[PDB]
Specification:
This is part of a larger assembly, with two copies of chain A (247 residues), five copies of chain B (31 residues) and two copies of chain C (295 residues).
Chain A lengths: L2 E2 L7 E3 L7 E2 L19 H4 L22 E2 L9 E6 L22 E3 L3 E7 L8 E6 L19 E2 L6 E5 L9 E2 L13 E6 L14 E5 L7 E2 L15 E4 L4
Antiparallel strand pairs in A: 4-13, 5-12, 6-11, 6-14, 7-10, 7-13, 8-9, 8-12
Chain B lengths: L31
Chain C lengths: L58 H5 L3 E10 L13 E5 L6 H7 L2 E18 L14 E7 L20 E6 L5 E5 L8 E2 L24 E6 L8 E19 L44
Antiparallel strand pairs in C: 1-9, 2-8, 3-6, 3-7, 3-9, 4-5, 4-8
The chains are: A mainly beta (247), B little secondary structure (31), C mainly beta (295).
Chain lengths: 247, 31, 295, 295, 247, 31, 31, 31, 31
């Protein structure tokens, strides 16, 4: 009431405040809300959907050829196809994902990651294929027998033409962070390594450039916590229209 | 916890209470 | 549907589920996202009760972070002496999200957002050193911030007689004070702000592309009330908008490339990877070559 | 167990308890602490009702004392002219308890503490005397204090365009004002802050020892909003953190030696006793020689 | 409400305030709390446990030999073994105790002190031993007959090998302070003096360097009050990592 | 006595009301 | 929503609640 | 409408509520 | 009339309500 003493946290514009603010328009009735489709009441609805990684992070892979990975019929068994640094913050294949760009706004992230890989090949292109996810603590595997001990799943291409590996939530803490140091107990999620299982068998009339498209989504237990400011964009100068919307 | 003393409903606190959400709009947009 | 979930969903115990005829993991990408949950296949899970924070990743909690939308360090002096389009103690900032890329990316996450703009105008003073003036104290200027809708005539001077505010919304707040925590409402004739607009503002063919006529909130004309001081100051008015009362629609790919223009979404990435046109993600040495490896 | 005690426990009347077969005072150290209470043996106590203060020695009352954690007297000037790693009107203080030994010892009393950091940022201005400038008033600078989590890019300039705060938490408070009473939450991915961490942050062998990756709260980037004044000031930003909502685990030996480094618990005492390596307690002349004696 | 007048105690950062403070992270759900062991909800739980004093506060006693006290088979009866200044604040044997370091954070202290001494000798090392605690008001005793009049307790070593003397709470006031003047009615707790009772009897094959380890704990009536800032640590310069965590 | 008008439970007053304590965790950690 | 702590009824908040209105005074001022 | 939070009854708001008045003391001071 | 919003009972308003008093302690200290 009348006796009021000012707190130390007064006159502070805490960007993340929720205090009610004066209405500039005083009896302003807003527009009636129509049932627009696609209301997102939680970003964890955006992250729970598929998003391609850029598996070919390669200088030869320019433009369109980064999402796909051209695997062929290798003459050797137990061969490494590709490895994905499951690092959302360390600008890896994931960064450019709806589970990764949104989690780049958050210092803390948790929950089981979805790992759905589709096969963009011919119908006669057959062959089993294994998605090894290993919990962190060692190096990224390059051979099959040292990677099948982790979370692996064998994928015959078949008819549905897409497997969904599920990354389990293995961590000593409750929330893996994005400490910008991939090699940190509190930051490393592990390594998803892809291997030939029974080799890509393709006929002569089918191309021997059969392509895998992967996606990483989130599950219903996934959660992001401390919200930071994504390092994706950079305003090193003022954009066009600045000093002109000011006019 | 709301200190909305103004006469406009828009000028209230930031409603961080819309916990209900439907992920099947974007995850499973079928049938 | 009908999910009123407040915490992260608990996983249940999974056993050896090696069953013929149905399979959880082999899904179809070519409908949408997949429904293979953790105890369904690919792992033998344990029953863990999940009490993790979902309130912090709410879309209102995501978007009610008051970030910068216009930083104008307009020069406060006797502009009369010599000034040409030099912010004569006032700038007519047309209210656009698009000036600063952080909150621009946050609002361009979504196609449509109905929200109320909690506009906080933090104003800082600096004595300009081009005239080699002394510090002589930082003055407590009362700074008028008039929000004019479109169609209303923007002022042309500091004492332009359009600052009378017979019907225009304006605040009169000093600098030795808390900043002007004002809330501009849902000032849209449509039911959402079309942050992206695949259309032209005018009915003519030569209209500018991407600017929604519904989302023209207007100009936030910010001025200095009192007359010019003999010593020149650089008044830097930073308007921060907290999207409050958030209702978002149609989430989108985030903008990976650096932004170029306010009015459109024109793109040019960095000269190499990362965040380049031909390579959004920074390139590795090979497909099987793994970066950031503990050895 | 099940003790909900609010006051000190009252002692009961003790008599001549000279009983054969059981004894209270002769306990066993080599399990833990002893259970010989006052009326059990060694004294013939009187029934005194004990109404002494236990709320003042609560662990929350012990630990919710807002003590200093970072004092940066960064020089606020036109750093552009000449500055190399000289806090160009802003410092990226990585949030660590360990900088100031009082609250560092208070939090290193315990292995684990879940708490919310009530961060109060008291900022004081002083005109720097190296340029022999006059006093010319102490200005009321609005001082932005942006807390960035780890993974977010720290700014590199005063106007570095990372101060837009689209999703980053920041406060905008002046100096002629109460200090920024802000509360940073339990910003840990684990269920407690491991104040001590017998482990390495990275999975590699060359990781730094003792820094918990869960306890990397981030950086508290504190900047000056308005542009540089012609007269240079020494802005001293003192951030004080009040461990609020205290839940402490595993109390420890307090740090007796003077602290050496923030990142680890490296030790070197004073050159003689007290608080030395070979003698923590100041030495007496002999074992039976008694200091501070009334004669 | 609307009519509010500012108190004289406004805009003050009282370090010991409890006023609620703005949440920087606005809908931040924290980590779920697990049942970690050793929750200390009151420091008086830490002080109620044993802690060695440094009985040999001696320049010859370097490092390890300060906690123990080497008593031998003296040829004289009624001999003084050691005296402990029961001063928690005056950097005495206690200072370095969990009842003493924590009470060095508090200006006021009260409650009965525990005084538990264990015998680190051989099994055949026998001999009664007396722990005289005298209330303050006179000098520290050096002979047995002038010290047995106070709070004394005779300790045959036996089988349990540890006595627990209990310091009673004798004070004119309700709380002995730490006024930094040991010789102050409101600061002196008294003197704990240890004497031979029937001498340390040791065989030839056992060492005649038998050792006493003492502990001082607190009881359930012990209480600390005005919280000060312990004089144990001293930041005469900035620590390493300062000007580097700033970077 | 609590002036917690914010929407977060962590931002409340410093709860100096946890009077219950179990000293047998550290004093008598036996059986 | 009214913080009228003064003793005068005129000094209250701006009453933007007079929703009732009779347009027939000016639109149809007949019979 | 009274924001008297002090412990003294004199320090309250200016009581402009003594509407009762007797004009016959001065107008008709007879019989 | 008490605006004690702190968690300590000592930090309340100055209690000028101890009207009870025993003058016979000092006036008539007999029998």
């Amino acid at each position: 009431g009348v006796p009021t003493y000012l707190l130390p946290g007064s006159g502070q514009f805490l960007t993340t405040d929720d205090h009610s603010s004066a209405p500039v328009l005083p009896c302003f009735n807003p527009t009636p809300e129509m049932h627009i489709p696609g209301q997102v009441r939680n970003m964890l609805e955006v992250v729970q959907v598929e998003s391609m990684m850029e598996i070919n992070n390669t200088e030869s892979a320019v433009g369109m050829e980064r999402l796909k990975v051209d695997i062929s019929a290798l003459t050797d068994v137990d061969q490494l196809l590709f490895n994905i640094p499951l690092d959302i913050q360390l600008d890896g294949p994931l960064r450019n994902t709806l589970v990764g760009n949104i989690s780049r706004y958050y210092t803390h992230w948790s929950g089981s990651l979805e790992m759905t890989f589709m096969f963009c090949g011919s119908f006669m292109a057959t062959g089993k294929l294994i998605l090894c996810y290993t919990p962190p603590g060692g190096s990224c595997p390059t051979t099959r027998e040292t990677a099948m001990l982790g979370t692996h799943i064998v994928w015959d291409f078949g008819l549905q033409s897409s497997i969904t590996l599920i990354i389990p939530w293995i961590s000593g803490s409750h929330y893996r962070m994005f400490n910008n140091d991939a090699k940190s107990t509190n930051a490393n999620v592990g390594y998803v390594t892809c291997f030939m299982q029974t080799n890509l068998i393709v006929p002569s009339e089918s191309s021997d450039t059969c392509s895998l498209i992967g996606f990483i989504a989130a599950k219903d237990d996934f959660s992001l916590r401390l919200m930071r400011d994504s390092p994706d964009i950079g305003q090193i100068d003022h954009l066009h229209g600045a000093e002109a919307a000011y006019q | 916890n709301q200190i909305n003393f103004y006469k406009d409903s828009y000028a209230a606190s930031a409603s961080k209470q819309d916990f209900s959400q439907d992920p099947s709009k974007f995850t499973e947009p079928v049938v | 549907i009908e999910s009123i979930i407040k915490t992260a969903t608990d996983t249940v115990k999974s056993e050896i589920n090696a069953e013929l005829g149905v399979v959880p993991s082999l899904n179809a990408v070519e409908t949408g996202a997949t429904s293979n949950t953790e105890p369904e296949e690919a792992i033998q899970t344990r029953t863990v009760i999940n009490q993790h924070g979902v309130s912090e990743t709410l879309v209102e909690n995501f978007l009610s972070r008051a970030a910068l939308v216009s930083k104008r360090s307009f020069e406060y002096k006797d502009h009369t002496s010599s000034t040409a389009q030099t912010d004569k103690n006032f700038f007519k900032w047309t209210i656009n999200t698009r000036s600063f890329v952080q909150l621009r990316r946050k609002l361009e996450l979504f196609t449509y957002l109905r929200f109320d703009a909690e506009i906080t105008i933090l104003t800082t003073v600096a004595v300009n050193g081009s005239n080699n003036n002394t510090y002589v104290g930082l003055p407590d200027l009362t700074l008028q911030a008039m929000f004019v809708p479109t169609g209303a005539l923007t002022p042309e001077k500091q004492d332009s007689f359009h600052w009378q505010s017979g019907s225009n919304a304006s605040v009169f707040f000093k600098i030795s004070d808390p900043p002007a925590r004002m809330t501009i409402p849902f000032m849209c004739i449509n039911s959402a702000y079309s942050v992206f607009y695949d259309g032209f503002a005018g009915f003519e063919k030569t209209g500018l592309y991407g600017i929604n006529p519904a989302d023209t909130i207007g100009n936030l004309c910010v001025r200095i009330v009192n007359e010019h001081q003999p010593v020149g100051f650089t008044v830097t008015v930073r308007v921060y908008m907290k999207p409050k009362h958030i209702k978002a629609w149609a989430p989108r790919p985030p903008r990976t490339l650096p932004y170029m223009s306010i009015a459109n979404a024109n793109y040019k990435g960095k000269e190499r990877a990362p965040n380049a046109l031909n390579a959004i993600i920074g390139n590795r040495d090979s497909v099987k070559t793994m970066p950031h490896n503990i050895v």
